[PDB]
Amino acid sequence: RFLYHPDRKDISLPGVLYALGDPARLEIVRLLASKGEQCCAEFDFAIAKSTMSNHFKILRESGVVLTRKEGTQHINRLRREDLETLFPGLLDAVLRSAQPL
């Protein structure tokens, strides 16, 4: 079922901003807010699977993405309820100027 996720007390703005500080990690967050839950395979970035796995590990450890294992799929979800509880209005400002890749 659910993969590792930090608690809300352990989420910082420097970690969220670090996880959004990559072209791929930001497109993952842009698509997870516009298209809802998505499996890791829908992200067809032309990058190695070692870099993609680390990207999702950063997304999870930062408090931004909640990943779940249902079958053989890795389902990711934007933890927007928790990010708007700590930082109200931040995700919207980042997604305003986020240009689609």
- Please tell me whether residue 17 binds a second copy under the rule CB under 8 A: yes
Strand order in the sheet with 38-39: 38-39, 74-78, 65-69
Q: Are the C-beta atoms of residues 61 and 4 closer than 8 Å to each other?
A: yes
39 binds, among a second copy, Cl ion, none (CB under 5 to 8 A by kind): Cl ion
Minimum distance from residue 91 beta carbon to Cl ion (Å): 23
Answer for which of 26, 31, 40, 52 binds a second copy (CB under 8 A) is 26
76-95: contacts with a second copy (CB under 8 A): 86-90, 92-94
Instruction: Kindly tell me the burial class for residue 19, based on how many C-beta atoms sit within 10 Å of its own C-beta (0-12, 13-18, 19 or more).
Output: buried
- Please tell me whether residue 98 binds a second copy under the rule CB under 8 A: yes
- Please tell me whether residue 19 binds a second copy under the rule CB under 8 A: yes
Minimum distance from residue 72 beta carbon to a second copy (Å): 31
- All residues at 6 or more sequence positions from 40 whose CB lies less than 8 Å from its CB, including other chains: 52, 56, 67, 73, 74, 76
| Tokens found for residue 54 | 């680390």
> Where does this chain bind a second copy (CB under 8 A)?
12-23, 25-26, 86-90, 92-94, 96-99
